[PDB]
Symmetry: C3
């Protein structure tokens, strides 16, 4: 069923930020499964407890981009998220028009693994044919980015996209207003912004932007929207300017604005991908298959020189995730002679760029990690860099590697982890049970601060300690008790 798959996607698969295709932003030890729709129904049915503050804060997870710029993913508190997901499920007949939006490529869709939101799920076949069909006969390409699609989207504009702005103003119940209310409750009862990473906020953004897509489609524009990025194909240059103008009016109707720095008009034919993508693939040592596995095994010189050229392209161009693309090109065609060289190169690049840290888990088995403790020092230096740069993705993945592979962590970097206080990193540290007293001191400071949003920012740590009977429930409601009684575990075993 579409409805049941939507419910299980919202809670069991796309609650945590898990929208990436190949490697996740979060280590795989964190999983939102065993959090079923029945449990969320029981949470939403709970009315006990008193909150001094209005709304709920969320666990914040800082993941670096390719330019080391932090992006704040969020894990919503399960009470507010359960209510929001239940309301989205209950009115899915009125919401599912976002599925039949041909212009939006990244939208809800029934996937095999159980998700609804997967970025870049479509294959290169249909992708290539689609951009060649859209770009045919047109000599201008328009790239326009919404400035604040996650950070300043208007929750009160959720009705305005559904029934119209004027009709929603006269009408002030409808499901869109309740969706607005629950989306506000997801983040501290704040009217602006949505948590990045869950599919509920992606559904809300699709609902808001579907009216803009419909208005642009009714004017005859050929365009594709990936989340907030619009790519339009225009026969003439005034058509590009008119698309930009009409998109500006349609975004300003819902209190949104184009990123004036990011919008650009290029001459077709450009490239189907970015230019660095073709530069990398045309220089890839693994670009041709041989159908025998011994032939397509890369040597040391090939991979080392290709990664050096990738660093050259990242410095010179820097138009995207060049290093991650090249590493994913060469990481699966390695032989056992060259594992140490590529692994040390990945260690250096991962110290410089934390987004390359998860690739260390690809070759984490072949590398003799005991050795002469040099790898322990390198991993702890990576942890120091992650604590200094305040990035949660690299620290979480490195801590996952150290816990799984029994790499020892010094006390000095544990002090830096507590000073940073990333919720997922502290969840991993609590799951190791070595550092119980420091986690206890941290959560005691959070409790004695008596701020409800401070507890909400570490609800996952508090629930992981409560579920293992290491700490009482910080809240006075029954949501944590309901989740513990039905065996909800966000750090499950295999």
């Amino acid at each position: 069923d579409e409805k049941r798959h939507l419910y299980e996607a919202l809670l069991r698969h796309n609650y945590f930020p898990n929208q990436k295709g190949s490697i996740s932003e979060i280590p795989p030890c964190f999983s939102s499964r065993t959090f079923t729709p029945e449990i969320a129904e029981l949470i939403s049915s709970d009315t006990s407890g008193r909150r001094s503050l209005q709304g709920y804060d969320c666990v914040e997870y800082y993941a670096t981009r390719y330019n080391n710029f932090p992006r704040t993913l969020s894990i919503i508190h399960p009470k507010a998220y359960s209510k929001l997901a239940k309301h989205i499920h209950d009115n899915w007949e009125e919401i599912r028009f976002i599925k039949e939006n041909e212009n939006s490529m990244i939208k809800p869709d029934m996937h095999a693994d159980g998700r609804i939101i997967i970025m870049n799920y479509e294959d290169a076949e249909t992708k290539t044919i689609r951009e060649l069909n859209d770009g045919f006969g047109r000599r201008f390409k328009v790239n326009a980015d919404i400035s604040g699609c996650f950070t300043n989207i208007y929750s009160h504009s959720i009705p305005w996209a559904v029934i119209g702005v004027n009709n929603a103003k006269i009408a002030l119940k409808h499901w869109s207003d309740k969706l607005d209310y629950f989306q506000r409750q997801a983040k501290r009862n704040e009217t602006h912004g949505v948590p990045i990473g869950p599919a509920t906020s992606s559904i809300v953004c699709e609902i808001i932007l579907s009216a803009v897509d419909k208005r642009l489609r009714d004017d005859g524009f050929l365009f594709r929207r990936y989340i907030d990025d619009y790519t339009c194909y225009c026969k003439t240059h005034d058509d590009a300017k008119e698309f930009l103008h009409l998109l500006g009016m349609e975004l300003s109707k819902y209190k949104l604005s184009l990123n004036l720095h990011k919008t650009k008009i290029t001459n077709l034919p450009g490239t189907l991908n970015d230019n660095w993508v073709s530069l990398l693939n045309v220089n890839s040592p693994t670009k041709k298959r041989f159908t025998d596995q011994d032939l397509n095994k890369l040597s040391s010189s090939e991979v080392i020189n290709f990664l050096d050229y990738a660093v050259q392209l990242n410095t010179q161009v820097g138009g995207g995730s060049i290093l991650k693309y090249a590493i994913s090109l060469v990481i699966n065609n390695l032989d056992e002679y060259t594992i140490t060289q590529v692994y040390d190169y990945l260690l250096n690049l991962s110290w410089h760029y934390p987004m390359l840290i998860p690739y260390l888990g690809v070759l984490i088995e072949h590398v003799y990690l005991d050795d002469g403790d040099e790898y322990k020092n390198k991993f702890n230096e990576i942890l120091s860099m992650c604590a200094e740069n305040k990035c949660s993705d690299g620290m979480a993945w490195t801590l996952y590697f150290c816990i799984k592979n029994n790499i020892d962590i010094d006390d000095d970097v544990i002090e830096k982890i507590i000073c940073f206080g990333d919720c997922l990193s502290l969840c991993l540290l609590d799951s190791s049970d070595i550092y119980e007293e420091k986690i206890n001191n941290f959560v005691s400071d959070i409790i004695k601060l008596d701020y409800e949003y401070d507890i909400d920012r570490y609800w996952l740590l508090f629930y992981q300690r409560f579920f293992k009977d290491k700490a009482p429930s910080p809240y006075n409601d029954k949501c944590f008790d309901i989740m513990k009684g039905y065996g909800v575990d966000f750090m499950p075993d295999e």
Copy 2:
């Protein structure tokens, strides 16, 4: 025999512009065969008919270059061309000194297919050895282009190249003066310019430039001439300047001038080809043979990324036919999975660059052209672009593909084809017999205009309608009747 091969080359093979090596400028449905030297002798023997105007105009065929710049190829009227080819044949003993010109690479030569003029016929072996032998010991390379070798060459300078300028001035019969007269009669009795594409004008240009080559050779210069482009290899820089000066005086002796924008002096060692050629071949996915056909079959990612890199190189460098070179690199190593992707990419690039249109005939069989009529819309949009940009090569090749592969053509683009009025495109439209009344209206307008040059500009259309008994002969001479009686057909069946 050299003489008979020359005659049959001039009339049966190199009458139409057919000097290209791999793919012709004209679709293969047009052929100058079945136009034998005996028929041209009979045409030249004909003296009947009266012309109000002096000379003959020619069919004009606008072929795009790599930068979309139009180049006007010309098909000479068969009366003037027959007289010109007969005069060139009859005095071939006095003309054939252009064969023994070592500096001119593109010159008449007895070829297997029957032509005398084929551009770049020589193999990479002798080419590579020749530019390495010429460039050895020299540190300067001079590239100097004649500005108007086709557009402002002096017909009265045809005697001046043969017997000398002063001796030809005192002499004012000689065969060079009659060659001048027939070359003038080839284009409207105009003293300046030669029709591009036939080998008669190439022979005339070789005759004129052979004296310049002899004067440069007698001074000890090591140089190579490709049509109008001079490439000289010099030990010192003053030798380069002295070559430029002496070439300027030798060209000004025959009322020619160097293209001052195009001339340049580069430092040896450069590259044997252009720099983009080596950039393409060093990045080519097909650059290495494997001797088994399954191994050297390119995947989708390889060809798509190589063509994206080719578009990048065409935008960034633009020093030559980059896209045509890369397409010819990858078009013969395609598997049946990737035919649709590469064909759609070629359709887009061919809409943007009409010179890539003939490559659509390489994969015209494997593509399911019926489908859902999308390919029909794409071909008609290409026809619209060709009508708007006023290019005859792309329109002629697209019309050939549509007629051969039964792609339907709307009336709206037929209006644009009649508005453009390309002679070869209208020949194809008349050969389809669907659009008889519109072609009849067009030729009725040409007849009622009563301009002899206007009839000469569409002589091929008029003769194709006369040969199929769809229209009477527009002329009053017996040339068309002679060609019809001996079964001359410029649109023959296989």
Copy 3:
């Protein structure tokens, strides 16, 4: 034994400049073998003879770099070199601390072929792991070159590096002062500069720079020294500036200075090699092994286009020996169809860049050198270029090829060789015995000039003529008689 291997390395293997890894700076017909430590002991024991001048001059050998910049290698006179090598051997216990210097990569080391100094002997395994371990956790790379490590190194600073500057000043016997004296006697009793190429001067430079390396190491700096080039890896930018400052003080302590033009600070991660190295290897047609020899045989188009791209990279970047790297990439994977093309390309590039001349010996057998005498003209034009540009490496290698392969040399270029008067080229000319009277006139001019340094600059030519009984010994000592009596030959047969 380490001591005996050091002695035989200093005299039999690393007397001549033979520090290169793959191809030597000197043709292999020159060999310093059959010059044993016993013979050098006998030379140093000799006290006969009188010298008007103090010290000895050395044979000068001008080898081009990648930018055609001459570098003066030197072959020390065997009396001064024998004394210097004997003194270095006799106190090797006090000198061998330069072996245990971890920061210096190019240092004395017991090698299989008998040398102690081989540049870049270490494999890519340990090299790659070492630069990845050193560059981990650091974001700045410092490249600082000593300006005059060969040309203005202070011989009187040899004690200052050993016992300290102040202690050596108070002390004014010690072995360092005698090493200073013998190093001065090696080059004309001059206090500044060392002869480039022998391992004795490399040992002296290592002795001087070992104190600087120790002072930089005791401050906690992570750095690597290749001859005169320092590469330091720093966590912060002030650490880079502090390394530069401390290295400046440590060099100024021994009257050395940094090359202020060459020093630079780059951002890690850069590339393990230079950027052009990865650009060449990522574009190399031979970069992947196939384990069957027929598959990894390069075609003509592959090598020709790769060498054209290499010339493009050498012109555009010019950061190192790009052409030599690419030629060594493609010279060992050639098939017999493409030998002529690559050989002519190498002939052109070797005329333009004499450092590529030794590669002509790789394919000197497969090329039909008799032919139509064109290769003779090309080799003599290369000899003319070498005489004009005053380069000894290209002339010596070309003369070796002409003598070995019986390529005739005209008298006109022999005049240019005598006018240049390179000692090794004249040694080869004397070893051919064709040009005996011209070599006799040259050495008669040197003798009648009555300058002892002029005889010392051609001591190798004088000894080669004396050993073959073609001329008497120019000196009045017994060193040449000792070398002749024990069969020392610097041009030995196989």
